[PDB]
Paper text:
TmaT is a member of the betaine-choline-carnitine transporter family, and we show that TmaT is an Na+/TMA symporter, which possessed high specificity and binding affinity toward TMA. TmaT forms a homotrimer structure in solution. Each TmaT monomer has 12 transmembrane helices, and the TMA transport channel is formed by a four-helix bundle.
Analysis of the TmaT-TMA LCI structure indicated that when TMA is located at the substrate-binding site I (LCI), it is surrounded by four aromatic amino acid residues (Trp146, Trp151 and Tyr154 from TM4, and Trp326 from TM8), forming an aromatic box. In the structure of TmaT-TMA LCII, the TMA molecule is positioned at the second substrate-binding site (LCII), which is downstream of LCI within the substrate transport channel. The LCII is also composed by three aromatic residues (Trp325, Trp326, and Trp329 in TM8). Comparison of the TmaT-TMA LCI and TmaT-TMA LCII structures revealed that when TMA enters the aromatic box at the LCII site, the side chain of Trp326 flips inward and acts as a lid to control the opening and closing of the aromatic box. Upon comparing the structures of TmaT-TMA LCI and TmaT-TMA LCII, it is evident that the proximity of TM3 and TM7 resulted in the closure of the substrate channel. Analysis of the structures of TmaT-TMA LCI and TmaT-TMA LCII suggests that after the binding of TMA, the hydrogen bond formed between residues Ser95 and Asn262 may play a crucial role in the transition between these two conformations. The overall structures of TmaT, TmaT-TMA LCI, and TmaT-TMA LCII monomers are similar, with the RMSD values ranging from 0.4 to 0.7 Å.
Residue numbers in the entry:
A (entry chain C), B (entry chain A), C (entry chain B): 11 to 504
Amino acid sequence: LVINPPVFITSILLIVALILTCVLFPEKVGVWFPAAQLAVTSNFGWFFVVTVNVILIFAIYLAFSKFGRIRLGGDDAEPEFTKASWFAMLFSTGMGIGIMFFSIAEPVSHFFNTPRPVDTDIEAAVQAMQFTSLHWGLHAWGIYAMVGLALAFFGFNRKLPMTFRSLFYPFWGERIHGWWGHIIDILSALATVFGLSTSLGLGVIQITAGLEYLYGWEISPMMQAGIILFVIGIATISVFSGLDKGVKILSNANMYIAASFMLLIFILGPTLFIMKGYVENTGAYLANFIDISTWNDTYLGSGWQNVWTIFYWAWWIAWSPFVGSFIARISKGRTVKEFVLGVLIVPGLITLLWMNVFGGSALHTILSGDVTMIAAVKADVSTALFVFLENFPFTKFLSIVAIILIFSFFITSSDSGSLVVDNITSGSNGESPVWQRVFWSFAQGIIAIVLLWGGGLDALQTAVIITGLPFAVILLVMCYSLQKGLKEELAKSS
Amino acid sequence: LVINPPVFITSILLIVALILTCVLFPEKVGVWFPAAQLAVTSNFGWFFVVTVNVILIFAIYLAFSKFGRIRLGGDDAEPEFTKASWFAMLFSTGMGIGIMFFSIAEPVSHFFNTPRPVDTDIEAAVQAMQFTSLHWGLHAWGIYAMVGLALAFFGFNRKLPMTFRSLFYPFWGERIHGWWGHIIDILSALATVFGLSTSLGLGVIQITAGLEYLYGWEISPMMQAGIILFVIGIATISVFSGLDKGVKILSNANMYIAASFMLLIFILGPTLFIMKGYVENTGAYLANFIDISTWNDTYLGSGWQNVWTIFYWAWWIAWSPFVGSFIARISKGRTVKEFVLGVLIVPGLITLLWMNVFGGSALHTILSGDVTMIAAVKADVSTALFVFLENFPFTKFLSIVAIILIFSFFITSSDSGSLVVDNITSGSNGESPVWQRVFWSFAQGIIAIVLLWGGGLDALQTAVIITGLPFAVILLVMCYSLQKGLKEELAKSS
Amino acid sequence: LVINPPVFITSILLIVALILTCVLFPEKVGVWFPAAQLAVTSNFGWFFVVTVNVILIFAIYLAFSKFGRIRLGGDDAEPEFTKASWFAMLFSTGMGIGIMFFSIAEPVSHFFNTPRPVDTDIEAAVQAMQFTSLHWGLHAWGIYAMVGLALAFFGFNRKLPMTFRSLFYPFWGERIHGWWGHIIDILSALATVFGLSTSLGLGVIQITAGLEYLYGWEISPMMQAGIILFVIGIATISVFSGLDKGVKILSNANMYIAASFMLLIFILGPTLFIMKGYVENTGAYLANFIDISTWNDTYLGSGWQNVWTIFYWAWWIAWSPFVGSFIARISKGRTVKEFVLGVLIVPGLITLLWMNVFGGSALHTILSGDVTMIAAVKADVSTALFVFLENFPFTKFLSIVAIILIFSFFITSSDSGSLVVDNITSGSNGESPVWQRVFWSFAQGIIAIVLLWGGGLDALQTAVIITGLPFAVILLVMCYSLQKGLKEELAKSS
């Protein structure tokens, strides 16, 4: 039937409270949401920057010290997931629609609308690619590495349930069960659901922009919700039996077609410029790492960071329980240093390669003289990928491949996240029998539809920033508790 | 009865030789002092930069290697200072009065009078804060860390008196007592006395400047010496028995009221700008660390470094034996890595926090449009803190708190410097009974009058620069001898 | 008799095929050499940058890890060198003639013809010195450190002959003997022969330009051929018995007179500017290390890298069998970490000191107002050192000393290179006998004649870039094989 801690009922109550906030106040929520979002990010952007930087340098320290000799699941455990397939399986479920919606719109947006004042067009493009490298580089995956390492260590080496409530066992003891770890699990479930709803909204907005650009359709008002309902239905079918699609084979096939799409853009585009720009921009991002990682825009105060950088940090921090729990169930016998390296460096380098392959080619097209992408981004940032594919051979085929790639990207993460929310709100792995995951996928669809009806992109950014604000202190306490637990486990072993 | 090494007589003779050189030919020494100072700094600024960078790089190496596993006073020794009080008590006889004089007058001066050319005001403020972070950051405290570490290791592990004569014990034999280590003690006593006279002259160039700004008094020149005589009398009272003031309670309550003053400026000022600028300026100072650490201004040759950067390095290197010997008295059972970390990083970060809290708020007021601090600094740099406190609520109360803060800041340092000088010129802890303490404090005050009458801030700069010039080779030989001693001691562990 | 692997006769056939391509159809080779060179570097400059950066960071890692505890020649090898003779005989034979050619011609060229655009003139001079520091710094000697360390480890710790055929022993096993290490031996012999011919051509055009500027003579190509024939002749009667030059005597004397020449320029020039610019430019080169090490000039596409930095990386990579084999025979018992430090840091710092002493003094002369060096470099780059010595006391004596220094520099490398080519082309150490060292020196000279007659600088750059193109993959496979060999050897220690 139904199993419930009191983390269930008040989570549903908070979700429906935001629902009637966004449906009984239809015109009064379009001014409450961006004002509250702007106040939260303008007062805590320094805290988001400090949290992300502390998390990343803690990942580097935990990989490159004596704490990296620990192996998850004890010294007798085996990896069992065939590391080349493990990289693909962690990349497919843990990423999307980030490298499709924002692979081109973000470097062009940083080109024409610069973060800090710049002199020429070449230096503006260099700054745009280095800020894209900041937003999709080591800082994006250091949070993922910390949460996956903490959840894997405290779910394997300590025999606790793989839950954010049970992660603070060395910091707080067995009194986490008495309503004081319930708030942590409430914030974890809310952050996972709101991040998945933000990804859902970005995916459907890019899909309807591509459908309007390709065939000249008119799906603004209503069948967008039908696209949501169809996608959640096929995702729950993949959750349902008959075939276990969306766990192992669909992730590998999706990564294969994503690599084929990226290689096709790399070959058909300016490959020499792409390779030289990849080397140059990776080196310039590593050289100016501390300068752009801790940049807070305090002197100019232009507010560029509040829509891009702090939104990205709150977005990656709000997807942290879902991807951290997924790679924590995945990595059963990895060395801790090897785990942090394989979650940090290799997916970070692959994401930087995707950013270079798309954004550097777009900036080469812009610097050649073609400024149609600038006007397309200034119209709406959702058509940037398809406008980029317009000046390519096989435009319609590549646009259809991109639409199918987005479709697989946000049909994999919803399937991998429904079980994560079910494990958070049920307290077990096999339990419950499979009806609540369909309800949680439908809740993600309902929240995405409601947020997109009561506001554009800014409603999703608002929701993800507000649920990621207390996760800064949650992840800092998580990092300190992981350091204490690793000290305890290393002092335990001979 | 008095005690008598030769260092006492042929250091007193040097002191009264400079007294005779300045009190006779009064107008003629104003052309010998800054010309000789300018020659020394223009010919050895590269050497000062090389010495400070080598000391800091050596501190980072000695903290993060196998030499950091050594513990002072043997392995069985336990520290007894309750470390949260140790951080404050090294900070009292330690940092100061440099924050209270140059926390505001230095970033405004680097704003309007830039070291290197800039293009706007935002970049000028960023470069001003990063040069301030260079001058009051890790390079400041690394010198203190090495002198304290060398004196503690060669006075606790080697069972020698903590004197600079015994600091070269592995590099030589027992030949230190035969007139060739006496010059080292001559330069150490002169460095302590001249640096404390520079700090006293700066603190008395201040305080009464705020008295003039508050009450419109006329004070100079005759009643200015009365402030010196009164604050030396209270310092010698703190030397005297009955109550042991200026040692522990006045080294903790002063830190408490200084932290309360910093928190009051942080709260009543632009706290969001202060926090964001603190994070951004600390990150930009760490990012551009090697670019501003080794900058010698060779191509421009403007001589900006000659009055700020090389003066600051000569001031730190001239205050080396004072706080180095006192911290070596302080830290008995600290681990070497823990010692270097807690003397370098945490006081450096706290000093950078004070720099950001005052200078970033001053730069925010300047960039808002208020350029009264610019004209105030262009008039005289003594009144910059009080002009900054003018537009704050409770101006008179904060200025009185600042004056009492400066008073306690150098009245602790004068007592600890009398301890250090009467330890160095004695070669013994207890002896002599207290009559040279009052004599050495009175000599410090007399040098303050003599230097302040024959020039303002400039003559103090000449005295500290010419006196700290041979301490560069003294500290380089000290670092090499410390490496030899650590390599000798670490091989002795069974 | 003749030692005849097929490596020898098909290397001879390749060399005479280049002879037939050059002396027949001279306009065809003169129009096809810079086009093919430009195509190769424009398509693989990113690969040259990646290879050089990977080799350098691999040197830093493999010196600063547990692989550095291995000692060449076993644990009781006793290296038989004074650490001064090793450095001097390493520096004299393994460097040239860009210390005499590009010490002044390169920073002045980077001054007036900037790599990337700059605003003022001081920034142009700083950029020129930091790009000279990039070209003559750690990247220049990291390649030598890896090739010398791999050849020394695989020739001493494995009892294998010092040849690039045996350098891939843990990658293929015993398959290196049959026609598969043969091609690597062709590429190695062609690389060292073409690099030595490039150095011979640079030295003789500098000698010709210096004689023309000194005595006002005219130079025919047949007189230049006589200079080559005489210089190869003194080398061949240095190879012959009776007397040996050096084997270390000529190298030590050349190092002594080079140090005396550098000290004379340092003393008689602007010594304060030289020292301050040395400290500042070394710090700025270390600060902007990653930014200029991976800069590929992708956005501008100006082709500044085309003639300067990819030619430099192909030149240092093409001299790698020569210098690597020579340093490998030189050092018999050095610790691997100590070896990489003594080949990387100290010769890199000495080369940066020479670069600062000459180029910073030239830039001081230019920034003072004397712009005759700009017009001299714009006329011909081979007269820059002598034009610099024209505005210098003792012009004729210093020019004669510079000519003798060039003479020693390009007789010592040829004398050490005939032995290296002979050992590579025969497969055995010595016992050739001396009939083909003279022949290989004559072939080196003849290749220099035909490269100078069929083109100026561009033919030498073309030849060295073409033979250095497959050595990028050869050195990457070499680095991976060295890592596998060190991992195999370090596990063999009980």
